[PDB]
């Protein structure tokens, strides 16, 4: 390939001590001059152990310069260093692109490195397998709580036609006919007496739906829209096309459905990696096919401010967009490019009025106070401390990427970012994050000591729920409620009514469900689509909190030690499944990552839990599968 290429080695592995080895290859017939590699790397290289040259980390952006000046044609570079870290169980905790920058017989030059993969020490042996499954007649996912089927079928033609008779249904109706358009090429069309009858019933709660086909008609009951939206998507799963006839085809069948939660969420990373309105919309789509009713717009990070400040024009101008000659530095992958992109109000207000129609409500995350590189770095003047000598380090091995809460500007800013954020999302509700603030942070922040005396604050970890707490009080005063991870309850200064996502696992659900705050289940043991999905090393992913392979993830049961009586369970909203982008750039990674296993999670979400059984589910989702081959949507095979 490349004229130069990197080998990365793990040589050893002591306990939190992995020692790897460097060799940089110039294949290519050039002496190079005064050169410096900088490649992209999550882990945090220890500076001390490095054994040959000077090595520069800001997040995942490295560049190593050699002590030499010259490297020879057909030789190379060697480099050892260490980590802290368990042992790398897959290629893709390797380097994820390299980039040269060097001199030419006296010209400026920059090429492409060929990365290979890590060679590793220890891979997994163990291999999670999933068995011959059947295909089921009914490949329904979510399984309705309740159907019945009958032996025959009911069989129609474009000519079917639909009927309308309230208009709580006009929604789910036109987005039913949309996707059999979309997915099918079936143009049904609406008429006084369709054999498709959308008709009213106030017996049924919430997102709950009846839905009966028969030899005559096809028949859809709600109560609500969003049970309109809920019977819509099981009928499009339920339908089968036969293009010779161009006919659709339903069995005879009686079904019944609600959910067992009320909160079915799905996080989408837009910050490490920024997706397209179109590649959004399709997710919020494919996220309505499932059932879920949320999706939580994770728009702001250290690497990258998504969402438009109008009042504020420099988080979008300079937050939006990293690399070699940006402002904000590269990070995990487009060494080479400036990288980003945005979303603008008129944007936002479309993708919003987008999923309305498909009965997802869109939480905006603004994450603070920690994660907010992008913003500081957008915003200089009224969020950096001169005076402040704190050296901290965060999770993501940053040391300049956290808000000051005793700075007059980090109020100026939040206060201008709320404002317009409440206005543009309809939700009553706005995730402020709070997760991964670092240990050491403000300590010797001048107005922070200042502040903390001031108030008799005795932990630095009290500030943050002082500054979480002026968010939530501004919120209130804008008509939203508070959302928060679960270190929004670090310093207890928030109120009860701020409703806590428990990622790091289940614990803070129940610690904080105990105290009477409303809780989100998204433990990444169990809901993190950004994890592997098997054991084999050319998984890609992440693990820290472990393989998740589809079976674990179906597997899932909240609070599973928490009888069905207990009055903890009434303050679970309910369940959310993430994906985290650090590594994913492209849609044909982000689908093989999400599906199928964001469809179990549906499933958890949805089903109760009597009715969930992992051999069922195998069959519908064998039976779903051919859907998702239509749409061009590429999701890990759970039988290859
Ligand atoms: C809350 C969370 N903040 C961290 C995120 O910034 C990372 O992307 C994710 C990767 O799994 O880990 C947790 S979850």
Known sequence: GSEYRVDLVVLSEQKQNCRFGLTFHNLSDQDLNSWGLTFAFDRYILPDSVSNGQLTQIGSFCTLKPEGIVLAANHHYYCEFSIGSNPFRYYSDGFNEAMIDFVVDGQPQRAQVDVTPIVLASPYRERSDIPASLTHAQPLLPKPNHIEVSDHSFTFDEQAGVAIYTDLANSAKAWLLEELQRIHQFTLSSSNSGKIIFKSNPTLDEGAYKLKVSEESIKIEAGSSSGFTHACATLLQLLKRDEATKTMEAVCCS?????????????????????????????????????????????????????????????????????????????????????????????????????????????????????????????????????????????????????????????????????????????????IGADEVPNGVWSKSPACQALMEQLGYTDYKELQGHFLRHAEDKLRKLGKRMLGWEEAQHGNKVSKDTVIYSWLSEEAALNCARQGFDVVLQPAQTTYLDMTQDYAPEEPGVDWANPLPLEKAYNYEPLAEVPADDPIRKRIWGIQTALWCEIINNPSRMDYMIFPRLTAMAEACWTEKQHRDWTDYLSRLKGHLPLLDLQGVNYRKPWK
């Open 255 to 431: 079904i019944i459905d609600s959910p067992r939660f009320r909160y079915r969420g799905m996080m989408l990373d837009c910050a490490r990696h920024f997706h397209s309105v179109e590649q959004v919309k399709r997710l919020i789509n494919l996220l309505a096919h499932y059932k879920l009713n949320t999706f939580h717009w994770h728009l702001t990070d250290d690497e990258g401010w998504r969402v438009e400040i109008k009042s504020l024009p420099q988080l979008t101008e300079i937050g939006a967009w990293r690399g070699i000659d940006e402002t904000i530095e590269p990070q995990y992958t487009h060494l080479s490019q400036r990288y980003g992109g945005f979303y603008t109000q008129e944007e936002i207000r479309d993708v919003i009025a987008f999923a309305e129609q498909r009965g997802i409500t869109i939480i905006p995350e603004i994450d603070v106070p920690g994660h907010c590189r992008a913003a500081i770095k957008s915003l200089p003047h009224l969020l950096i401390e001169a005076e402040d000598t704190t050296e901290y380090r965060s999770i993501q091995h940053y040391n300049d990427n956290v808000i000051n809460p005793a700075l007059p500007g980090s109020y100026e800013f939040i206060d201008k970012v709320l404002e317009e954020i409440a206005a543009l999302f309809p939700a009553p509700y706005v995730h």
